[PDB]
Write a protein that binds this DNA or RNA. Structure first.
Lengths: 97, 95, 109, 83, 97, 83, 95, 109
DNA sequence: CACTGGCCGCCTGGAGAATCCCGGTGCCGAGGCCGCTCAATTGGTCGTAGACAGCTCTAGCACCGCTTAAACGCACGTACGCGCTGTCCCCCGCGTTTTAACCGCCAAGGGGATTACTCCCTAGTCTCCAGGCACGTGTCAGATATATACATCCTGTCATGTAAGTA
DNA sequence: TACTTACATGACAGGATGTATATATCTGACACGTGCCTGGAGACTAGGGAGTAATCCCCTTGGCGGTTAAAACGCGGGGGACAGCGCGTACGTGCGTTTAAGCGGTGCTAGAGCTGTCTACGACCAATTGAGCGGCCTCGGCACCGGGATTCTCCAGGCGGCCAGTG
């Protein structure tokens, strides 16, 4: 049989590697094109420096990742290792939106 | 007599008598209104100062203020606030 | 031979002061110079918000068959309105209590 | 020029790597949709603020200055882009 | 046989009663004693305005009822109805402190 | 003159009434001491700020105005005592 | 012909060399330091302005900014910054 | 005819600017006037905070076996100090990632 | 196999109390009146910041051309959530007993607050000079690349507990 | 009944790969040197903010007597919590494919940004007045008080359905 790990050990390696990681997790080009897609809905012919796309990007993993530590707190509270949507809106509602 | 502790008494009372001529006001509610006006004025003024600092502006006119309204007040309240504020500034320029 | 002292709020057709808002802006130290449109605009937005919240407060007070408004009515008025709740998420009303909002799972069957 | 549906450009493995940075064990298959929705809402709020900043300055290009100002308004002030 | 209400029915009546109600749920004088005690921990021979004690009373009740709403959400999250210390710590950890 | 135990002055049924205002139906037996502790923590955070305001004002008597200012500093602004 | 940009470059480099003589600094870390200094400066200045406003004081003093250090900076950082500031104003007054 | 020019930071014995921070306070519109010891105190506080975080950054760089500080080292410096997290909990970092934090049930076995 | 009486789940009716609905009364809270004051307003004047035009130059838009990394999709597989139910246990409901909270009533003085005084201080401005910023480069820590060593994770294989046959 | 022996599951061993461990290379971003100027700074001045003496009064602090609801404690009990077993399930991960993002390249201009004009505009000050707040009084909406209904709640035993005995 070929080599294959038990479920979650590769997830352990992924978590450890990516907390050690500082490089970018999301793709650059579709993120900039998504910012453009959202922007044309609010004002047409709108342009962006690459640095502003970088700053929106850093804010995007900042907000999202922080929501995932809140999600892990919620998930371990419910004695589960698998996260569910209600963890996300629960954390958002306790956070105060 | 004592020193005047400035408040929003008669203004809130007049806007009540416009919107509801018959209903009354309690003093606890009246303090709630004073703190409400103070808090909203502080938020708008702080965001206006922040916007003036960002653009290197020594001037706060209605344009920064409507900017701060579009920031702080969400959506429907913001566009309505633009509506009566626009009516007010147009009546002000027409005196 | 000076003209009659007529008021800026009446020039705006408003009741909230251009004068007090302008003075609190100047002495609040938010900018060096302040345009004339800023305090009249701010009085307009404050008057609209005040009119809206006292509208909801009066409707809640007549709903509770009472004539004089109380901070219970004010707090009820605030969190029936979703965008006002977004405006005042971190703000507590004194003697306002909490509007009845019971999670359905703890309700009896 | 005009775009419709690029919110799928934040790929599902991008969300997986984001959650791996957040320390997530298991990500359900339902999760990616409301994560895209939350990202939609958050970026909508941020760029609404930023567009209001730029339109205040009478420009047509969103700068990182107004971006970090919009993040400072929301209580998510970001370090490292000239704020 | 003396009449006895089932457990929780009086609890729901308490919820509806105090939720409709607006008055203070802490006796004002032991709260005043407590706040003078904690004030003396930081600065000696402190004196309190009665309105200051009442304002700290409303603020304390506000923080407690907000945290209790958060723990209600945490408890109904965890397939339970009894709030626990783990629910309270979940609320405090999510709220960012 | 000195006071040592008034944290028990916030009695257990009074905590029950507060939880009834919070919509809590069932309260565990270990909850009450924890609520006493976290209320102690919040009063510590508020009173250090308020006493700091007071000693800036060169006053010995704590005022409700400093209470409003300390509460609005922490993002817990309280209506009903300002002005 | 470019416009001069104001930053904290050589100052942070100096204190970094004082606390660690043999180390280097990256430009991204310098952006982090500029944002940090600007943000903490803005927090302290804003709370100092609010302290001046609450007590009807029209001036910013070392006493009220020391109050702001007690307010913002928690725990041992507060008292260490108090020691640093008192020592600094002491040898500034003696100079 | 004139006294020799002496920097006020060196008068206070600081590296952080008395002059630049004083000017930025005067043009930042926080008050009309500022006391003389206030910018000295503020520069001393900023120098103390930067000295602490740069000391922790150098410690992290020595732990990382690197000579030059990276914002990863700065994030490691901040999040491994509790009171700076009490200061900078709500501030997001560029290229810093997350502190290594795997919870107790998250670890296997 | 049908009738029918009995038994058990369950389903309905009824009874008591808790707050609501309806009166009854007394009271001080706010709404209005009066008086005062201080602060908004008007005009003029003087300085000044941003809107507008113009230019330019630079990085963003637009288009072009290779390269496998990312993405994705299927498939095997293993672990993941959770419902039933039992089981154990812990806190609400209520009654009773204590006790200090609340009321309410009275003395006293600490300091919050106000007014005056007088002096410490601090922005402003002219001017002078000097250290950080723009600009240029050169150079070694790190990005990159290639060869080993253990971690570690999973998987096989004997060691051993254990159940059964039988002398 | 104990001794022997075969079987199934767990303790011990070992391989494979991926990430750590060691070392060579080049390169550009860090780091040092240079011109500059503009921004920090020294002195003087005009002026005005706040620290402090004095006081007063009032509002907070201290003390005393009673009621009874708030608090506290115990009995009882029902509801809640939660873990084991099982059951169905759904992503995790391995691996081949696509394609489209990523990496390097080129052209133009939108507009970002700097510079000159000037003007709309805002700020400040004496006078003046007029609306807006301090203080007081009144009555009636509301707080406090009292009695019956509806609703809420909870319990028994009436009702229906099912089952088993019997003819």
């Amino acid at each position: 049989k070929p080599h294959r790990y038990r479920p979650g050990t590769v997830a352990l390696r992924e978590i450890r590697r990516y907390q050690k990681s500082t490089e970018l997790l999301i793709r650059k080009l579709p993120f900039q094109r998504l910012v453009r897609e959202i922007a044309q809905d609010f004002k047409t012919d709108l342009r962006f420096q690459s640095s502003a796309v970088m700053a929106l990007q850093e804010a995007s993993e900042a907000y999202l990742v922080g929501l995932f530590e809140d999600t892990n707190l919620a998930a371990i509270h419910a004695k589960r290792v698998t996260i569910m949507p209600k963890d996300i809106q629960l954390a958002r509602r306790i956070r105060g939106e | 007599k004592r020193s005047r502790k400035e408040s929003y008494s008669v203004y809130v009372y007049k806007v009540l008598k416009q919107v509801h001529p018959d209903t009354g006001i309690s003093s606890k509610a009246m303090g709630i209104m004073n703190s409400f006006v103070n808090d909203i004025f502080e938020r708008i003024a702080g965001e206006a100062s922040r916007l003036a600092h960002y653009n290197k502006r020594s001037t706060i006119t209605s344009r920064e203020i409507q900017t701060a309204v579009r920031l702080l007040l969400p959506g429907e309240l913001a566009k309505h606030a633009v509506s009566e504020g626009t009516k007010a500034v147009t009546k002000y320029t027409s005196a | 031979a000076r003209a009659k002292a007529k008021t800026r709020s009446s020039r705006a057709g408003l009741q909230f002061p251009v004068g007090r808002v302008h003075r609190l802006l100047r002495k609040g130290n938010y900018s060096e110079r302040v345009g004339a449109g800023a305090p009249v605009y701010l009085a307009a937005v404050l008057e609209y918000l005040t009119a809206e919240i006292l509208e909801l407060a009066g409707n809640a007070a007549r709903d509770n068959k009472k004539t004089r408004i109380i901070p219970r009515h004010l707090q009820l008025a605030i969190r029936n309105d979703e965008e006002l709740n977004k405006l005042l998420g971190r703000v507590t009303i004194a003697q306002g209590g909490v509007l009845p909002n019971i999670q359905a799972v703890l309700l009896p069957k | 020029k005009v775009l419709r549906d690029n919110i799928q450009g934040i790929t599902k493995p991008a969300i997986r790597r984001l959650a791996r940075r957040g320390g997530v064990k298991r990500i359900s298959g339902l999760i990616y949709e409301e994560t895209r929705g939350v990202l939609k809402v958050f970026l909508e709020n941020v760029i609404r603020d930023a567009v209001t900043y730029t339109e205040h300055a009478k420009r047509k290009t969103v700068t990182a200055m107004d971006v970090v100002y919009a993040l400072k308004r929301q209580g998510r002030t970001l370090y490292g882009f000239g704020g």
